[PDB]
């Protein structure tokens, strides 16, 4: 009964999107939509309409100490704006500058990202990744890494130093790299019928439309170093992060020390 | 010296922490504080009070016996 | 209602550490005069007629 | 076995509740001072008893910070105080006494 | 990687005041470590600024001090800071030592024994400082104490006359005490660095006496702000004495110049020496008084050898707590007796309190730890 | 010596000019306040409590 209640409540025609991609004319899809999905209650169910309220973000820390595991996992983030905010483009450019690293990468010391270069040269981690997770009117913006138990402090220091460096003193060339990394990422991802079908379905629920690739290029080309400094400071500088730790995390910095890494006394 | 990451071995212990900019620095300061100070004193008053009371008795007697020893008598 | 005074104090003065310092050094300048002026006024009032500056006018010439 | 041995046990339960480490949830062997013999005995504890010892010490140090104690329901009862470390410490001492007796010859 | 960790200079400051793992539960009795450091610095600054105007000659030693409090700009505030700072120094020293007895910190042998050396050199420093203004108590305090050294057999007088530079406390004694009062606080500060060298080898104890490696926090920001707050209370206590009662702890006789012929009626030390002055006068014999007077402080070096308890801290030892406060009240009795004339009944009380002092430390408190072990069945 | 002559190094100078100008005001106002410099302080409205 709990499951049928969940289905009749949420699997309603105004809340679904039939997406397709590949060799097919839109007519036969719309005909098949009328042929099979017509028998579905829609546009007025009852006085039982779901609505997503806002969700409070809390600066906080959760630390699962477990010294039996050989490598520690750390995820740190601030509050993101949400799906529809135009700031996500500039945030993804800033995250692309910091980028991501793995111990199987070939570049190592010559990588552009200062965090990746230092992480590979001094062997501060096995991997790290930035992320901008989007939800309705909220999100998690930050990074996740995994490293030896004696590298958690150095890794956190270099990570926060790059947030602060971009908040205050981002430069034009590296921002162009972040825009170029994003253009390549966007076109490489929409290669195949299944990625495009996902982009169609998810966008219609979040954006209410398909944002063409030419529009993403317009918003990416608008970003420059000033946009990154303003946009990064709006979400990173002097903000309470949410920290999650797991594994041998004795060397994980105290939250106050992490919170102090979100601003610079020189600025 | 001793460093973090080389101190000791701990397993299966979770710790939840709140940011200081989202909580009060004086949460229930008088509500819970004053009952806890009475508890802390009651739990230690019988350990600390007697010797200082014993001093206060010796201090009072010895000061009384001192003055009355030099005062003259009819002899 | 616009955001509280502490909110406009933060974004306008305390966000940058440089302006956070400029606020303090400027706040230290006016605090010193206002505190020394007020504090001396309390000391002299409590000691009215006893300090030399009160009996000074009697021996002008 | 007799009424007098219950009075010796009676004052031991009095001193136990007067020592007050049961108020923090600790056990008697959690409070022992770590010399070389004690450090070896702790090293020999099985994984479960080591992890239990670590959390009780951690919880008691957290209480000592706040100057708080546990509710009376969660205090360590004198009858339930497990001497989990004494059999290990007795054996470490017995070995050292043997090394010290060979050194005399 | 990080400049704070790899630079040869900053890594010592970083591994001592910033990233040092400290216990999460150390209480206000652990603040007196830093407060002693502040008092030592505070006494050196004011001490130096007084040396820019003080002269170490009998014909002007008394009046040069007067010249400071009257003519020198804010000389009076600098002097009373120095005189009361010494008393605050001894408040903190006695809290610092008492914290170590109660909580078992003396098990750090190297840290503790170097502490005993720090207590002796700070006492010798203040003893020589009190001679410099050359008041009545400055002279006669120096006379009664240095004369005790003549009781040493077969080298007594030769040793006393060598420390004097003559046949009594005189010009030569006043000048060298100034030189020794100058050199020692820097020797003290160096020994206070070795005091920290041996400490950081193990980290701090905590109120429970149980290891805190399972729960450590960085010294910054948690104990940087806690020591700053504690230092602020120290300045409150000092300035209350300087600005509202600068003559409360001092003796009025020291406002009279020295006089080798006229003796004041009651020769009493500062409050932080009364307990040992009482122990001295309670022993009739002269050489016995010196040994008991020296053993009153050197006994601290025996506490690690007289530890019987299976537990480290007295927190879980009620029978030892009562004996601990019996030591404080007995020391508060010797302090009281020290500032009183040697007459009935103070003679008998001072002898009882003197025996109770050494009996508590040597016999009773070790015996309590053994009784406490039996009650816990180990 | 000539490593720091290029587009990026001029962009970095641009980004830190507002900050470096503020620390100069913090140092300047801090120097005037610490020394009671009457040349500058006599022009401030409320700190004219000199009574020459
Ligand atoms: C009195 C002497 C004053 C000396 C001031 C020195 C300032 C300095 O070195 O600038 C570096 C400092 C760099 O800090 P940051 O910009 O936040 O970058 C962090 C680093 O990446 C590195 O960040 P981090 O995570 O490695 O460490 C953060 C660090 C941040 O604090 C510092 O590094 C300042 C250096 C300590 C000064 C101690 C004051 C005395 O906090 C500390 O470790 C200092 C704790 C102080 C312990 C004192 C114990 C008592 O910048 C300043 O503070 C300049 C403004 C200072 C105001 C001057 C008034 C005009
Ligand atoms: C000023 C002269 C102070 C004389 C010594 C006062 C002793 C004291 O408790 O200091 C508070 C303070 C409490 O710090 P804590 O780390 O939370 O506890 C330290 C012990 O664990 C304390 O051990 P405990 O956990 O067994 O607690 C003993 C209890 C002791 O409380 C009492 O016996 C007085 C109860 C006051 C009741 C209200 C009557 C008015 O203290 C408290 O629970 C908190 C007292 C808060 C002050 C409220 C006064 C009103 O300890 C100190 O500052 C010791 C140094 C004070 C010497 C200053 C002389 C210069
Ligand atoms: C040699 C020089 C002689 C000079 C004589 C000077 C005159 C002495 C004047 C007496 C002032 C007394 C200071 C105030 C005492 C407060 C004690 C207290 O608040 O209660 C007991 C406390 C209990 O705390 P626990 O840690 O056991 O458990 C806490 C769990 N909530 O337990 C503690 O906090 C006790 C910690 C130790 C305090 C040290 C004070 C004694 C100073 C002199 C010692 C000298 C030894 C040679
Ligand atoms: C020659 C003439 C020169 C004159 C120069 C005059 C200059 C006067 C001072 C101005 C400098 C301010 C620097 C500053 O403001 O940065 C220090 C730090 C910041 O503060 P924050 O952590 O809020 O971060 C701030 C985060 N934001 C910026 C986003 C809000 O300030 C603190 O933290 C520490 C504050 C605590 C004060 C006590 C320290 C003194 C030592 C002990 C005293 C008692 C015993 C001796
Ligand atoms: C100039 C004199 C001294 C100074 C500046 C000084 C300073 C310090 C400091 C800063 C600490 C670490 C913080 C703290 O524990 O509060 C400390 C710890 C300690 N000191 Fe001292 N000290 C001095 C003299 C002494 C004396 C006289 C003794 C005892 C006879 C002593 C015994 C100890 C012990 C045992 C510790 C370790 C305490 C613990 O870890 O719980 N020290 N000292
Ligand atoms: C542990 C550090 C120190 C302690 C405990 C200490 C203690 C004292 C005391 C109690 C007095 C008697 C003051 C009076 O009765 O008026 C005194 C006098 C004096 N001290 Fe120190 N002192 C220390 C460090 C220094 C230093 C480093 C110097 C020199 C750089 C110094 C210079 C003087 C001078 C010139 C006097 C004579 C002036 C006077 O009596 O006020 N002191 N000292
Ligand atoms: C120069 O005399 C200084 C005195 C003083 O109190 O200085 C702070 C003093 C004044 C009057 C009488 C004696 C005085 O000196 C002293 C010195 C003193 O030194 C010790 C302190 C503790 C333990 C042993 C001794 C010794 N000897 N113990 C007692 N009185
Ligand atoms: C002349 C002014 C010198 C300023 C130095 C300073 O304030 O030190 C930094 C800390 C606070 O900054 P943080 O530790 O959060 O680091 C921020 C990293 N982004 O402040 C304190 O709490 C330290 C106490 C200093 C005592 C002398
Ligand atoms: C580095 C040591 C500087 C010592 C200066 C000093 O002691 O103070 C003198 C003046 C006093 O202010 P004024 O308005 O009388 O001015 C009277 C002018 N003589 O203050 C100043 O003008 C500060 C000048 C700072 C320059 C480095």
Description:
The structure is cut from a larger assembly and holds chains A (about 270 residues), B (about 80 residues), C (about 60 residues), D (about 100 residues), E (about 375 residues) and F (about 50 residues). Helices cover about 50% and strands about 10% of the residues of chain B. Chain B contains two helices and one strand; from the N terminus they run E-H-H. The longest helix of chain B has 26 residues. Helices cover about 55% and strands about 0% of the residues of chain D. Chain D is built from four helices and no strands. Chain D has one domain: Cytochrome b-c1 complex subunit 7 (Cytochrome Bc1 Complex, Chain F). In chain D, helix 2 packs across helix 4. Chain F has one domain: Single alpha-helices involved in coiled-coils or other helix-helix interfaces (Up-down Bundle). Chain F is built from two helices and no strands. Chain F is rod-shaped, with a radius of gyration of 18 Å. The N and C termini of chain F lie far apart (about 55 Å). At the D-E interface, helix 1 and helix 3 of D face loops of E. The complex binds cardiolipin (2 copies), the ligand CCCCCCCCCCCCCCCCCC(=O)OC[C@H](COP(=O)(O)OCCN)OC(=O)CCCCCCCCCCCCC, 1,2-dimyristoyl-RAC-glycero-3-phosphocholine, protoporphyrin IX containing FE (2 copies), the ligand CO/C=C(/C(=O)OC)c1ccccc1Oc1cc(Oc2ccccc2C#N)ncn1 and 1,2-dihexanoyl-SN-glycero-3-phosphoethanolamine (6PE) (2 copies). The site of ligand AZO has 20 residues of chain E, from helix 6, helix 7, helix 11 and helix 12. Chain C: It is a single-pass membrane protein.
């Amino acid at each position: 009964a709990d499951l049928t209640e969940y289905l009749s409540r949420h699997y309603k025609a105004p809340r679904m999107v039939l997406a397709a991609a590949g060799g097919l004319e839109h007519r036969q899809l719309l005909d098949l939509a009328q042929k099979h999905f017509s028998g579905l209650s829609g546009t007025y169910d009852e006085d039982a309409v779901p609505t997503l309220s806002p969700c409070r973000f809390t600066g906080s820390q959760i630390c699962h100490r477990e010294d039996g595991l050989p490598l520690a996992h750390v995820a740190i983030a601030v509050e993101g704006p949400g799906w529809a905010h135009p700031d996500n483009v500039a945030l993804q450019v800033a995250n692309a500058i910091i980028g991501h690293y793995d111990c199987t990468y070939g570049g190592g010391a010559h990588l552009s990202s200062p965090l990746a270069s230092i992480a590979a040269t001094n062997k501060l981690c096995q991997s790290f990744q930035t992320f901008n997770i989007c939800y309705a009117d909220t999100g998690l913006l930050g990074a996740h890494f995994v490293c030896d138990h004696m590298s958690i402090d150095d890794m956190m220091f270099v990570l926060q130093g790059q947030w602060m460096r971009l908040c205050t003193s981002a430069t034009e060339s590296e921002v162009l790299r972040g825009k170029n990394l994003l253009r390549n990422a966007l076109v490489s991802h929409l290669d195949g019928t299944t990625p495009v079908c996902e982009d169609i379905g998810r966008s219609l629920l979040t954006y209410g439309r398909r944002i063409p690739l030419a529009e993403w290029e317009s918003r990416i080309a608008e970003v420059d170093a000033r946009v990154v400094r303003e946009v990064c400071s709006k979400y990173f500088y002097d903000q309470c992060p949410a920290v999650a730790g797991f594994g041998p995390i004795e060397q994980l910095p105290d939250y106050n020390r992490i919170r102090s890494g979100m601003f610079w006394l020189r600025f | 010296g001793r460093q973090f990451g080389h101190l000791t071995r701990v397993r299966h212990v979770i710790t939840y922490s709140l940011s200081p900019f989202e909580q009060r620095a004086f949460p229930h300061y008088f509500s819970k504080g004053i009952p806890n100070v009475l508890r802390r004193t009651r739990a230690c008053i019988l350990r600390v009070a007697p010797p200082f009371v014993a001093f206060y008795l010796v201090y009072t007697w010895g000061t009384q016996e001192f003055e009355k020893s030099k005062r003259k008598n009819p002899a | 209602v616009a955001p509280t005074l502490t909110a406009r104090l933060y974004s306008l003065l305390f966000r940058r550490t440089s302006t956070f310092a400029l606020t303090i050094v400027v706040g230290a300048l006016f605090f010193e005069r206002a505190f020394d002026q007020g504090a001396d006024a309390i000391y002299e009032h409590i000691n009215e007629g006893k300090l030399w500056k009160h009996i000074k006018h009697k021996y002008e010439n | 076995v007799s009424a007098s041995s219950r009075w010796l046990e009676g004052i031991r339960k009095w001193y136990y509740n007067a020592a007050g480490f049961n108020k923090l949830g600790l056990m008697r062997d959690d409070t022992i001072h770590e010399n070389d013999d004690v450090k070896e005995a702790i090293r020999r504890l099985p994984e479960n008893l080591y992890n239990d010892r670590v959390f009780r010490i951690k919880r008691a140090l957290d209480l000592s910070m706040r100057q708080q104690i546990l509710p009376k329901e969660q205090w360590t009862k004198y009858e339930e105080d497990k001497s989990y470390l004494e059999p290990y410490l007795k054996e470490v001492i017995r070995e050292r006494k043997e090394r010290e007796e060979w050194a005399k010859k | 990687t990080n400049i704070r960790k790899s630079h040869p200079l900053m890594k010592i400051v970083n591994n001592a005041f910033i990233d040092l793992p400290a216990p999460s539960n150390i209480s206000s009795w652990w603040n007196f470590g830093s407060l002693l450091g502040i008092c030592l610095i505070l006494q050196i600054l004011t001490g130096l600024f007084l040396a820019m105007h003080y002269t170490s000659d009998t014909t002007t030693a008394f009046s040069s001090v007067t010249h400071i409090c009257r003519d020198v700009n804010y000389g009076w505030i600098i002097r009373y800071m120095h005189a009361n700072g010494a008393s605050m120094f001894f408040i903190c020293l006695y809290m610092h030592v008492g914290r170590g007895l109660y909580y078992g910190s003396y098990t750090f042998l190297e840290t503790w024994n170097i502490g005993v050396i720090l207590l002796l050199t700070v006492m010798a420093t203040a003893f020589m400082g009190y001679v410099l203004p050359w008041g009545q108590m400055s002279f006669w305090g120096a006379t009664v104490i240095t004369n005790l050294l003549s009781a040493i057999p077969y080298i007594g007088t030769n040793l006393v006359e060598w420390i004097w530079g003559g046949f009594s406390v005189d010009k030569a004694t006043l000048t060298r005490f100034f030189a020794f009062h100058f050199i020692l606080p820097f020797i003290i500060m160096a020994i206070a660095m070795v005091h920290l060298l041996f400490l950081h080898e193990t980290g701090s104890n905590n109120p429970t006496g149980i290891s805190s490696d399972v729960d450590k926090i960085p010294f910054h920001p948690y104990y940087t702000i806690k020591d700053i707050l504690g230092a602020l209370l120290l300045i409150l206590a000092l300035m209350l004495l300087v600005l509202f009662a600068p003559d409360l702890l001092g003796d009025p006789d020291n406002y009279t110049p020295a006089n080798p012929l006229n003796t004041p009626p009651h020769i009493k030390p500062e409050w932080y020496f009364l307990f040992a002055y009482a122990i001295l006068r309670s022993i009739p014999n002269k050489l016995g008084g010196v040994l008991a007077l020296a053993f009153s402080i050197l006994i601290l070096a025996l506490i690690p050898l007289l530890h019987t308890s299976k537990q480290r801290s007295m927190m879980f030892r009620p029978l030892s707590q009562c004996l601990f406060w019996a030591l404080v009240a007995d020391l508060l009795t010797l302090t009281w007796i020290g500032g009183q004339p040697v007459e009935h009944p103070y003679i008998t009380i001072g002898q009882l309190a003197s025996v109770l002092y050494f009996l508590l430390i040597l016999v009773l408190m070790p015996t309590a730890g053994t009784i406490e072990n039996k009650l816990l069945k180990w | 010596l000539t490593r720091f002559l290029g587009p990026r190094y001029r962009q970095l100078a641009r980004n830190w000019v507002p900050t470096a100008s503020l620390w100069g005001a913090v140092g300047a106002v801090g120097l005037v306040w610490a020394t009671d410099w009457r040349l500058i302080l006599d022009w401030v409205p409320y700190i004219n409590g000199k009574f020459k």
